[PDB]
Design an enzyme around this catalytic site. Structure first.
Site, short mmCIF file in Angstrom:
data_model
loop_
_atom_site.label_atom_id
_atom_site.label_comp_id
_atom_site.label_asym_id
_atom_site.label_seq_id
_atom_site.Cartn_x
_atom_site.Cartn_y
_atom_site.Cartn_z
N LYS C 26 0.86 -1.18 0.00
CA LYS C 26 0.00 0.00 0.00
C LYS C 26 0.90 1.23 0.00
O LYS C 26 1.74 1.39 0.88
CB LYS C 26 -0.94 -0.02 1.21
CG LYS C 26 -1.09 1.29 1.96
CD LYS C 26 -2.39 1.34 2.75
CE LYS C 26 -2.70 0.00 3.40
NZ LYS C 26 -3.94 0.06 4.22
N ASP C 113 -12.85 0.72 13.22
CA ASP C 113 -13.27 0.67 11.83
C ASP C 113 -13.74 -0.73 11.45
O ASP C 113 -13.55 -1.16 10.30
CB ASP C 113 -12.15 1.12 10.89
CG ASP C 113 -12.69 1.75 9.62
OD1 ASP C 113 -13.70 2.49 9.70
OD2 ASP C 113 -12.11 1.52 8.54
C1 I74 Z 1 -3.27 -3.73 2.69
C2 I74 Z 1 -3.64 -5.09 3.31
C3 I74 Z 1 -4.59 -4.92 4.50
C4 I74 Z 1 -4.21 -6.10 2.21
C5 I74 Z 1 -3.81 -7.44 2.04
N1 I74 Z 1 -4.53 -7.97 1.00
N2 I74 Z 1 -5.37 -6.95 0.51
C6 I74 Z 1 -6.26 -6.98 -0.52
N3 I74 Z 1 -6.45 -8.24 -1.29
C7 I74 Z 1 -7.47 -8.31 -2.39
C8 I74 Z 1 -8.94 -8.40 -1.86
C9 I74 Z 1 -9.24 -8.17 -0.52
C10 I74 Z 1 -10.56 -8.25 -0.08
C11 I74 Z 1 -11.57 -8.56 -0.97
C12 I74 Z 1 -11.27 -8.79 -2.31
C13 I74 Z 1 -9.95 -8.71 -2.75
C14 I74 Z 1 -6.98 -5.85 -0.83
C15 I74 Z 1 -6.79 -4.69 -0.09
N4 I74 Z 1 -7.55 -3.49 -0.40
C16 I74 Z 1 -7.44 -2.30 0.49
C17 I74 Z 1 -8.62 -2.25 1.56
C18 I74 Z 1 -9.90 -2.31 0.87
C19 I74 Z 1 -11.05 -2.33 1.87
N5 I74 Z 1 -10.89 -3.42 2.89
C20 I74 Z 1 -9.59 -3.40 3.54
C21 I74 Z 1 -8.47 -3.40 2.52
O1 I74 Z 1 -7.21 -3.29 3.19
N6 I74 Z 1 -5.92 -4.68 0.91
C22 I74 Z 1 -5.19 -5.83 1.22
#
Ligand code: I74
Lengths: 279, 65, 286
Positions: C26, C113
Site C-alpha cells: 500500500k 473501523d
Molecule cells: C493492505 C492489506 C490490508 C491487504 C492485504 N490484501 N489486501 C487486498 N487483497 C485483495 C482483496 C481483498 C478483499 C476482498 C477482495 C480482494 C486488498 C486490499 N484493499 C485495500 C482495503 C480495501 C477495503 N478493505 C480493507 C483493505 O485493506 N488490501 C489488502
C-alpha cells in the site's frame, strides 16, 4: 505493551559498552565516507556525545516552550527518537539542530498530538523565511528519521509506570502512608535518569521504580518491604537481587553523568559547523 | 472439534496484575479519578485507567537485556 | 525495493494497494498520518488474527507498507449469494474476529473501523483485522477521541450520541452488527444519516430507557426519541438458537459497560456449544 514491544526487543541494550561501540562505529563510518569522498576537522566520539547531550537539552527546551502545550509523552518519545537516531548516525553527517526538530515533529504525529505544520514551525524563534526553510528540512529528514528508527515509532515512557507504582503504593503499602510526597523528587530523578543513557539500557518500569525508591531513600524511608512483601520478591530472591542490582547500576549511571560545558560545546559547535560546510 | 476458551498466554516479565473486576474491592479505585457520567455513558470507567497504569507499572520490571 | 509489483488491488483516500511478489503493498504536512498510525500500531502487535506488517519503506513523503496478501473479505462472503453461511461458518468467523479483538483490546487498542470488508481472509481461511487507519490506543483519561469513527451502519449508539470517551464497546457493537449481517446476508441497520441510524437502531432493538443505559442522557448529542418497543431478537433472527440469541443480546446491549467484552463473548456458551467452528481450510471461498 512494553513486555512485547519493539523498544524491549530492539532498543534496550545490554551495557554502556555496546552503546559506545555503536556510536564509535557510526563515527568511523562517517570518517571513512568523508575520506573516500576526497584531518582534524572530524569530531571524536566523545565530542559527538557532548554535542548530542547539548542538543538533547535544546530539544527539551523546545518541547517545553512548544505551543500548544506538548504532552510529556510527546517529549519522551521525541527524546527517545533523538537518542536512538544518534546511536547509529554521526552528528557530522546529519545536523542535530535539524534532527531534534524532526524528532519532535514525528513524535507529535506518532503520539496523536495533532498540530498543523505551520503551528509547529511557528514555535521556532526565527524569521518566517527561516521557519519555512526549517519546515522544508524537517520534511526532508522525517522519512530519514523514520528509517533510522527502523520504523519503531511507539516509545514506552516511564511516566505511566510511575503512575501505576504510585497507585500500587497507595493501595498495598500503608507503611508508606502518603506516596504522593515522593512524586516531586522522583520526577526530578526521572529527569536526571533521562539525561543519561538509561532509557536505552533499562525498562520503563525499572526506571520508574528506581526513581521512586531513590526519592524514598532521599526522604530516609526504607521500603525494601514493598519489593519483598508486595512485589512477592521474597519468593524469588535471585530476581530480587537482580532488581536491586539494576537499580544500583541506574543510580550509578546518574551519579557519573557529566553535563556539557559551555566552552567545550562552543568549540565543538564551531567544529560541527566546519564539518557541515565541507561535508 | 469443539472450541474451548484458552486465556491468552503472554508473559509480562513482572508482578501479577489484579483483574479489572477486582480493582473495586481491593481499594485501587479510591486512588484513581472517578469517571464522569458522560464517560460512563460511553463505556469508559476509571477501572480501565487504573488497570492500564498498573499493567504498565508491572510490565517487564524483572526483565533484563 | 525487493518487490515485483504484480497486480493492482485497490485505491482509497490515502493510498493505493497492489499485489507484489506474495505480499500486498500500500503506497507541507509531511508523511500521511494514517500510514504512520498503521506503522506505529502494527509494529507493536503480533497475532494470527491481526494483519501483519512485514516491511516498510518509502521515498520523500511517500511510504510503502508491506502486508500479507489476503484473498477476500467478509463483505464479499456476505454479498455472495452462491455460498451458504452455515452456523459453523458464522461461528468460525465470529471466533477469529473475537480472538483478534481480544488480543487487540489486551494491548489497549481500539480498531474503530470494524466492518465486513475490513475483516480479510487468506487462502488458509484465517481472518485478520485490517485497515488500522482509525485505530487508537484507549484506557487513557487524557486522550479525547472523536465520535465519527466506524462507518455509519456499524456505529454504536453511544458513538451516534456523541461519546468522546469510549471503550471496547464501539468495537463490540460493530461486531454485533457484523454478526447480524452474517445472519441476514444484508446490512442490519442501513441508515442514511446519523438520526436515521439511531431511528433504525431504536425501531429494531427498542428505544433504550434509563434502566438499560443509566447515563444515556448525559451524552452531548443525545436526542430524546420515540418509544419503540423494538422487535424481539428471535423474530429478527428466526434461525438463531438460544445461545446465539444470548450472544447477540450481549453484543447489542445499549449500555456499553454492560455490553460483553471480547473475552466475555469468547467465554459464552455459543462458542463452546455444538457444532464447533468450521476449520479455516473449509470456510467458503468466493
Ligand atoms: C493492505 C492489506 C490490508 C491487504 C492485504 N490484501 N489486501 C487486498 N487483497 C485483495 C482483496 C481483498 C478483499 C476482498 C477482495 C480482494 C486488498 C486490499 N484493499 C485495500 C482495503 C480495501 C477495503 N478493505 C480493507 C483493505 O485493506 N488490501 C489488502
Amino acid at each position: 505493551m512494553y513486555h512485547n514491544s519493539s523498544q524491549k526487543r530492539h532498543w534496550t541494550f545490554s551495557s554502556e559498552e555496546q552503546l559506545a561501540r555503536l556510536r564509535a562505529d557510526a563515527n568511523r563510518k562517517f570518517r571513512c565516507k568523508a575520506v573516500a569522498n576526497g584531518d582534524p576537522v572530524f569530531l571524536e566520539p566523545h565530542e559527538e556525545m557532548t554535542l548530542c547531550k547539548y542538543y538533547e537539552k535544546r530539544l527539551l527546551e523546545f518541547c517545553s516552550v512548544f505551543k500548544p502545550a506538548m504532552p510529556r509523552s510527546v517529549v519522551g518519545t521525541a527524546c527517545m527518537y533523538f537518542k536512538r537516531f544518534y546511536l547509529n548516525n554521526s552528528v557530522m553527517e546529519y545536523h542535530p539542530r535539524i534532527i531534534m526538530l524532526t524528532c519532535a515533529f514525528l513524535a507529535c504525529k506518532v503520539d496523536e498530538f495533532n498540530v498543523s505544520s505551520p503551528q509547529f514551525v511557528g514555535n521556532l524563534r526565527e524569521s518566517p523565511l527561516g521557519q519555512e526553510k526549517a519546515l522544508e528540512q524537517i520534511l526532508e529528514y522525517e522519512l530519514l528519521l523514520i528509517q533510522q528508527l527502523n520504523f519503531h515509532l511507539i516509545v514506552h515512557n516511564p511516566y505511566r509506570p510511575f503512575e501505576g507504582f504510585l497507585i500500587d503504593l497507595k493501595t498495598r503499602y500503608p507503611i508508606l502512608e502518603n506516596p504522593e510526597i515522593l512524586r516531586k523528587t522522583a520526577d526530578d530523578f526521572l529527569n536526571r535518569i533521562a539525561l543519561t543513557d538509561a532509557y536505552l539500557l533499562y525498562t520503563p518500569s525499572q526506571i520508574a521504580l528506581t526513581a521512586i525508591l531513590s526519592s524514598a531513600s532521599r526522604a530516609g524511608i526504607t521500603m525494601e518491604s514493598y519489593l519483598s512483601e508486595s512485589l512477592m520478591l521474597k519468593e524469588n530472591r535471585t530476581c530480587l537481587s537482580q532488581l536491586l542490582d539494576i537499580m544500583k547500576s541506574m543510580r550509578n549511571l546518574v551519579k557519573k553523568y557529566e553535563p556539557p560545558r559551555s566552552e567545550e560545546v562552543a568549540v565543538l559547535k564551531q567544529k560541527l559547523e566546519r564539518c557541515h560546510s565541507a561535508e | 472439534a469443539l472450541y474451548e476458551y484458552q486465556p491468552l498466554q503472554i508473559e509480562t516479565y513482572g508482578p501479577h496484575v489484579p483483574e479489572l473486576e477486582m480493582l473495586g474491592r481491593l481499594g485501587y479505585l479510591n486512588h484513581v479519578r472517578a469517571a464522569s457520567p458522560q464517560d460512563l455513558a460511553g463505556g469508559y470507567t476509571s477501572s480501565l485507567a487504573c488497570h492500564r497504569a498498573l499493567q504498565d507499572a508491572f510490565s517487564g520490571l524483572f526483565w533484563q537485556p | 525495493k525487493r518487490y515485483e509489483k504484480l497486480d493492482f488491488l485497490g485505491e482509497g483516500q490515502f493510498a493505493t494497494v497492489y499485489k507484489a511478489r506474495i505480499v500486498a503493498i500500500k503506497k507541507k504536512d509531511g508523511i500521511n498520518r494514517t500510514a504512520l498510525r498503521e506503522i506505529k500500531l502494527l509494529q507493536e502487535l503480533s497475532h494470527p488474527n491481526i494483519i501483519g506488517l512485514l516491511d516498510a519503506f518509502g521515498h520523500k513523503s511517500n511510504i510503502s507498507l508491506v502486508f500479507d496478501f489476503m484473498e477476500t473479505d467478509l463483505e464479499v462472503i456476505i454479498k455472495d449469494n452462491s455460498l451458504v453461511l452455515t452456523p459453523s461458518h458464522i461461528k468460525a468467523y465470529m471466533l477469529m474476529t473475537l480472538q483478534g479483538l481480544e488480543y487487540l483490546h489486551q494491548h489497549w487498542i481500539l480498531h474503530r473501523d470494524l466492518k465486513p470488508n475490513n475483516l480479510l481472509l487468506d487462502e488458509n481461511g484465517v481472518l485478520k483485522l485490517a485497515d488500522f487507519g482509525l485505530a487508537k490506543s484507549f484506557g487513557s483519561p487524557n486522550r479525547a477521541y472523536t465520535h465519527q469513527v466506524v462507518t455509519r451502519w456499524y456505529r454504536a449508539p453511544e458513538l451516534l450520541f456523541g461519546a468522546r470517551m469510549y471503550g471496547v464497546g464501539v468495537d463490540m457493537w460493530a461486531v454485533g452488527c457484523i454478526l447480524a449481517e452474517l445472519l441476514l446476508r444484508v446490512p442490519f441497520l442501513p441508515g442514511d444519516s446519523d438520526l436515521d441510524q439511531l431511528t433504525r437502531i431504536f425501531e429494531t432493538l427498542g428505544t433504550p430507557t434509563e434502566e438499560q443505559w443509566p447515563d444515556m442522557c448525559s451524552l452531548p448529542d443525545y436526542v430524546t426519541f420515540k418509544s419503540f418497543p423494538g422487535i424481539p431478537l428471535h423474530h429478527i433472527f428466526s434461525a438463531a438458537g438460544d445461545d446465539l440469541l444470548d450472544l447477540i443480546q450481549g453484543l447489542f446491549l445499549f449500555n456499553p459497560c454492560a455490553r460483553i467484552t471480547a473475552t466475555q463473548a469468547l467465554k459464552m456458551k455459543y462458542f463452546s456449544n455444538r457444532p464447533g467452528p468450521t476449520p479455516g481450510c473449509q470456510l467458503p471461498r468466493p
